[PDB]
Structures are given as structure tokens and as C-alpha cells.
């Protein structure tokens, strides 16, 4: 059946599979186009970039990025690692272009979407790369508002230092489509002042929090873990 997302990841119950090769990330060519406040979240659209290797049948191309956060800095990601929650979550969305005619079509099939999850952890450290996104937020303060990403930004710089990953067959966060998750438990670090700009964005009221509360891992659903 359908496996709703997000979930809690029981690290101890995760099964280790030798068929996982190392994941291969090529965001070197991916430049961002427009940034959008959807009324529910920050979305950053990308032209170019793809992922390959690991358990993937073929290359999946980068479509876009979503940003999530909570009311308080200490608890605002979607997914959880042993009931621990990070400050927020980046969701990098990819789809199966090799196979399908479009993203629109890709959503209709369980091999269509692959969403990489990068955790945001608030420390006492201004993240210079993440700041580029923060600098845009004035332009998209209004709801249903798009604007040109007005700076140089390499998405490669938001990658964790350690790219070991959990993976499971879930859904998109809004349940619109099945999707396969790749979740890096090593987070990237940001400052509290950076995450606070997001809470000043207007909603469809302000977007003070936008994460989805977790779901039961289904009996048949397995969560796999690669040792890098």
C-alpha cells in the first residue's frame, strides 16, 4: 500500500543492503532560476543538475528545492532520526527524465520521484552559503510570489560533510505522489537569525511553521541504510 511521509527513522531497525553503491551527486551545473513563496513554503527552482548511482535505475534530474521549518528553532524538520528532530529540512526534488515525458507524468509513478532530504541545524554559526537564500526572502515576502534568484549560488555548497543515507519508499510531503526518499542524517549548520527571516513570510497570518507531522512506518515498509 501507500506509505505516508514523513516518518521517523529507527536507525536500529534500518536494514543494510550491499546492492547500494555510493550515491553520486552532480549539482556542479545547476543554477537556480526563480525563488517562490507558495503560501506554505519557500521553493527554489533549478535549471540543470542531476543525481545517479546508488540504488538508482538511472539518472534523475534536479527539478526544485523546498524549505521547511518550525515555530521554534529546536524542532522544525519533517523527518526524524530516532525521534530527534532538527531545526528544519531542505527537500531537493528530482524526477525520472530518462524514462518519462515530464515531471507532471513522473509524479504518477512510484519510480518517478526521488527527494533528497538535507537537515538544517541551528548552531552559533552564520552559514555563508545558506545566507544566499536568506538574502532573497524580502523579494518573496508576499504569498504566491515568484522572483528571480538575484545572486550567485552553488547548490553543491549546501551538501552535508557526510553523505551516508537512509532511504525508503514514501510519498511527497503533501501526499500528491509516491516518492523515494534519500535522507542524509548529518545536517548542515545555520544561525538562528537566518531561520528567523523565513517566519516573516506571509501565508495564504504568517508562515511561522510549515512542517508535516510524522506517520506510522507501515508493516511491509523497509528503511535501508548505506554506510556511505
Amino acid at each position: 500500500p501507500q506509505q505516508l511521509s514523513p516518518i521517523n527513522i529507527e536507525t536500529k531497525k534500518a536494514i543494510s543492503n550491499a546492492r547500494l553503491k555510493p550515491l553520486d551527486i552532480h549539482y556542479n551545473e545547476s543554477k537556480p532560476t526563480t525563488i517562490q513563496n507558495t503560501g506554505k513554503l519557500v521553493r527554489i527552482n533549478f535549471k540543470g543538475g542531476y543525481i545517479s548511482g546508488g540504488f538508482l535505475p538511472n539518472e534523475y534530474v534536479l527539478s526544485s528545492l523546498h524549505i521547511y521549518w518550525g515555530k521554534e528553532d529546536d524542532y522544525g524538520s519533517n523527518h526524524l532520526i530516532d525521534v530527534y528532530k532538527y531545526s528544519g529540512e531542505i527537500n531537493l526534488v528530482h524526477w525520472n527524465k530518462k524514462k518519462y515525458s515530464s515531471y507532471e507524468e513522473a509524479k504518477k509513478h512510484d519510480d518517478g520521484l526521488i527527494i533528497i532530504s538535507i537537515f538544517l541545524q541551528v548552531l552559533d554559526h552564520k552559514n555563508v552559503y545558506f545566507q544566499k537564500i536568506v538574502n532573497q526572502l524580502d523579494s518573496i515576502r508576499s504569498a504566491n510570489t515568484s522572483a528571480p534568484f538575484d545572486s550567485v549560488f552553488y547548490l553543491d555548497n549546501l551538501l552535508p560533510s557526510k553523505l551516508d543515507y537512509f532511504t525508503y519508499l514514501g510519498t511527497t510531503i503533501n501526499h500528491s505522489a509516491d516518492a523515494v526518499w534519500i535522507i542524509f542524517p548529518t545536517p548542515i549548520n545555520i544561525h538562528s537569525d537566518q531561520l528567523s527571516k523565513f517566519r516573516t513570510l506571509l501565508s495564504l497570518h504568517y508562515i511561522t511553521e510549515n512542517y508535516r507531522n510524522p506517520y506510522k512506518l507501515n508493516d511491509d515498509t523497509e528503511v535501508y541504510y548505506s554506510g556511505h
Partner: antibody
Amino acid sequence: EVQLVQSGAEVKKDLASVKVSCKVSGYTFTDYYMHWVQQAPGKGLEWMGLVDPQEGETTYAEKFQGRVTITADTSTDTAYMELSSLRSEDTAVYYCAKESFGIPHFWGQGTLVTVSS
Amino acid sequence: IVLTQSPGTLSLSPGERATLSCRASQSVTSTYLAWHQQKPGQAPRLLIYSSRATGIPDRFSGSGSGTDFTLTISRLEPEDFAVYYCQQYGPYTFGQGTKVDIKR
């Protein structure tokens, strides 16, 4: 640069469904929102709804709710607008329009749908 | 929700200044109001969102906050005589419209 080419004017009997189209060019369709607006002859503008073409997610004005369906074809770069049960009063000019700073930035030329028996 | 523009219709000559105004029922959150021009038998045109749209000349200028906003055209012209609309965003309700005719 940006061009919005809407379908030609239509004449429809009562209780019929028309499907007005919008053909988009000169920008990335999915990177921006897409709005639809009504203008009855002589009277002013009235916002009908919008669509995110990337995911095809829509929100309509409650006034037009139920009797309207906005869609987006990412393959043909074509937004559509489908009126459900047509009435005399639905006689109007219907504009598709590209969003750019929260609002309809670049407008199309409209489509004069006319309703009569 | 509801916007009402002033006046019903605004009569003036070329060369002088035009002061259009739109007033609202509830606070326009974070002051997100926009002004559209519409000439007859034509598509509307985004003038301002007090932010200038590219293509729109130095003549025009918007301002305001809360529930009182004002479009100002310093130094009128013949092409500027049109129907004008105020839109509230950030929903999407339109002003009932202000017709700018010629003072005879």
C-alpha cells in the same frame, strides 16, 4: 520577450462548457504562477483564480468555485480555463496572465466568450 | 477584502498632475497593493506594485499604507487618459475602477 497567445473568441449555448486556452512563450512556464481574470462588458476586472504550473495546484475565488477548472500543460506550455455550466451572465472577456511579483505582471489579450440561446 | 477607489471618475487636462486614490476596508498586510492601467478594448497593464514595473515611465508613482493608497501621475499626457484599477495582494480583490476622462 514574453508572449501570451489566448484562444479565439467563442459563442456558446446555455448549459455548455467552454475551454479557453492560453499559449505561453518566452519564459519558463513553471518558474512563475499563472492567473485568470474576468471582465464583463462595461463592468471592471474580477480575479477568478490561479495555478502553479509546476505541480498543477490551483486556488479559485469562492465566487467562481465549483463552476471553473484551471489547468496547466507543461508539455505544450499551455494554461487552460474551463467554465462548467454556462449562463447568460458569464458573457465576458477572460484574461490569462503571467505572475511576477505576487500579481498579474504580463497579461494576455483576452478571449471573448459569449453566451446566448 | 473590499476596495473602493476615488473618485467615481476623475476629469483633468494634459500637462498637469493626476492624483488617483484607492481605500480599503481592512489593513493591506505588509502594504501589498498594486495599480493597473486599462485603455479601452485592451489588455490591462501593471504600472506599480510604490514599486516601478520595468517599461513604465518616470511620470507615474504610487504610495500609501494601511487602508489608504495613492497613485500619482506628475505631468500628464494624452496616452495616460484611461481606466485605472487598484489590486490588493499578498485575496486578489480588485477596485471597482476609476475612469480618467478629459476636462472640457
